[PDB]
Design a protein around this ligand. Structure first.
Ligand SMILES: *[C@@H]1O[C@H](CO)[C@@H](O[C@@H]2O[C@H](CO)[C@@H](O[C@@H]3O[C@H](CO)[C@@H](O)[C@H](O[C@H]4O[C@H](CO)[C@@H](O)[C@H](O)[C@@H]4O)[C@@H]3O)[C@H](O)[C@H]2NC(C)=O)[C@H](O)[C@H]1NC(C)=O
Ligand SMILES: *[C@@H]1O[C@H](CO)[C@@H](O)[C@H](O)[C@H]1NC(C)=O
Ligand SMILES: *[C@@H]1O[C@H](CO)[C@@H](O)[C@H](O)[C@H]1NC(C)=O
Lengths: 49, 114, 97, 48, 97, 49, 49
């Protein structure tokens, strides 16, 4: 949010792992490093009943 | 730095006994120190001097260096191991005279034969 | 039993609370006489341990003699220590007394 | 000592096992600390 | 239990459980912090006995203040009480060296 | 209580020396932990699955 | 490394030679170390073995 309140820039926090990093620090600029982020989930391919 | 890269003079810092040498290997979550110390045994009691003075020349006195002057007349032994050897200029230092130093008049060691 | 036959010593007695609240204070590893034995043997080792090279031999020398070597070792000459032995002992005694 | 409580306590897992083990270890630590400390104060040789 | 039936009785007992579980977790966390601290401190005590008591120290400020001469140790309620005797100079004068 | 070797003081200008006549070498083993296992947690997955 | 003054020079000397300097430095005289070099090495070896 700019001083005048408009949104000029944003991060989609679920787009990729880099985006998740920015969101977790609530910043567009984070320091260099190696960070753990949410795992890449396995998803169901079907169901058994 | 204290143990492995140096001989330590700090009692109990490295291992028990007198420290000689340490080695290091890695361990699952750190280092494993292997401290080799010197452990004395079979101690005996002997009678020692604080120092020796020439009885004829009372201002000329010696004290042992890293050892003791023991009766056996007087001889020198290293501090960690009893093993009498002659008192020589290599195991003594000249000191100021003291009331506790012995006055010797016969078998004067070479540093006092002046 | 003390907490039953006499009861709590005062308000908020945390020793008697143990049997009520569900907690227990455990005894120490060594009793008092053993700990005293360790420091007593330590006292008797001081003059003869901090004397010369190596940790293997013991010089059974007077405490006073040890003090004078300790003072000489920090820069007080022997002529001074010899003239002042009673003065030194008195100052030491004042410090501890 | 209330059974209803104990029944509900069980749904929190082995809570009390964790409390006891944590303190047991913490207590062993002092016995080891003391044993090591005194082993080092101990003299080899001493005068009476 | 005496006042409430199970669907509400449960909620009330559960509040007491949560509070007590919290208390015990806090207690344990502190016993672990306090025992870790005491253990580090015990190693400091170990070093002082060896550096201070069994030896004359040349390390300024390690033992007591001033120049170290001799230290003594007695037991204390939860540890050791060190008695460090140091040499304290006074009445300094200036000379040319 | 394991008593230390008792060495008497003398009423004299001499002193008693308790000195070794023998020796051995021994090894004090010591372990120093320098690390702990490093762990990260996918907190969102842990809590909500 | 544990041989003389300063941390800047390295004396590439035998381990055994280092041990004898280390023993001499704690109060065992050179006459003793010289007579007992094999005895000392054997005791050292027993300690590690
Ligand atoms: C080996 O020989 C030495 C040298 O003779 C001997 O040590 C000397 O012993 C005498 C006493 O037998 C000391 O002389 C005096 O002893 C009294 C004892 O109370 C002191 O009070 C005296 O001090 C006063 O006088 C001094 C004179 O200058 C003053 O300076 C001082 O401030 C006091 O006013 C005095 O010490 C003598 O000093 C010592 N010598 C030394 C170097 O200390 C030694 O005992 C003999 N060895 C053995 C085992 O007998
Ligand atoms: C022996 O010890 C006593 C203890 O008071 C002392 O007064 C006496 O002078 C001592 N004798 C010697 C030879 O030191
Ligand atoms: C030193 O102790 C060992 C222990 O067995 C013994 O075999 C050896 O003979 C001893 N040496 C002396 C000089 O007593």
């Amino acid at each position: 949010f700019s001083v005048d309140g408009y949104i000029r820039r944003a991060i989609d926090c679920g787009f990729n792992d880099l985006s998740q990093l920015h969101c977790s620090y609530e910043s567009f600029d984070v320091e260099s490093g190696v960070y753990s982020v949410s795992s890449f989930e396995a998803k169901p391919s079907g169901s058994v009943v | 730095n204290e143990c492995v890269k140096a001989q330590s003079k700090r009692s109990g810092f490295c291992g028990q006994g007198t420290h000689i040498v340490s080695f290091v290997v890695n361990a699952p979550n750190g280092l494993y120190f292997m401290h080799v110390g010197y452990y004395p045994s079979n101690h005996i009691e002997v009678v020692s001097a604080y120092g020796l003075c020439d009885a004829a020349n009372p201002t000329n006195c010696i004290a042992p260096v890293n050892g003791y002057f023991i009766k056996t007349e007087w001889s020198y032994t290293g501090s960690s191991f009893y093993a009498p050897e002659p008192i020589t200029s290599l195991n003594t230092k000249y000191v100021a005279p003291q009331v506790t130093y012995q006055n010797i008049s016969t078998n004067l060691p070479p540093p006092l034969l002046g | 039993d003390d907490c039953m036959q006499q009861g709590p010593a005062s308000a908020r007695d945390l020793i008697c609370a143990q049997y009520v609240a569900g907690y227990k204070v455990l005894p120490p590893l060594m009793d008092v006489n053993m700990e005293a034995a360790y420091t007593s043997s330590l006292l008797g080792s001081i003059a003869g341990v901090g004397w010369t090279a190596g940790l293997s031999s013991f010089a059974a020398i007077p405490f006073a003699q040890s003090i004078f070597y300790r003072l000489n070792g920090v820069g007080i000459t022997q002529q001074v220590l010899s003239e002042n032995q009673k003065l030194i002992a008195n100052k030491f005694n004042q410090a501890l007394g | 000592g209330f059974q209803k409580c104990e029944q509900l306590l069980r749904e929190y897992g082995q809570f009390c096992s964790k409390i006891n083990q944590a303190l047991h270890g913490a207590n062993l630590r002092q016995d080891d600390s003391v044993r090591n400390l005194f082993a080092s104060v101990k003299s080899s040789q001493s005068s009476p | 239990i005496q006042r409430l039936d199970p669907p509400e009785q449960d909620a009330q007992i559960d509040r007491l459980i949560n509070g007590r579980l919290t208390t015990l977790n806090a207690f344990v966390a502190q016993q672990l912090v306090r025992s870790e601290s005491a253990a580090l401190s015990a190693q400091l005590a170990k070093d002082k006995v060896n550096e201070c008591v069994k030896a004359q120290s040349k390390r300024s400020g390690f033992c007591g203040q001033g120049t170290h001469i001799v230290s003594f140790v007695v037991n204390a309620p939860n540890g050791l009480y060190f008695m460090h005797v140091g040499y304290y100079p006074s009445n300094h004068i200036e000379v040319v060296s | 209580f394991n008593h230390p070797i008792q060495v008497d003081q003398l009423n004299s200008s001499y002193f008693k020396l308790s000195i070794p006549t023998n020796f051995s070498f021994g090894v004090t083993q010591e372990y120093i932990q320098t690390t702990i296992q490093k762990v990260t947690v996918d907190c969102k997955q842990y809590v909500c699955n």
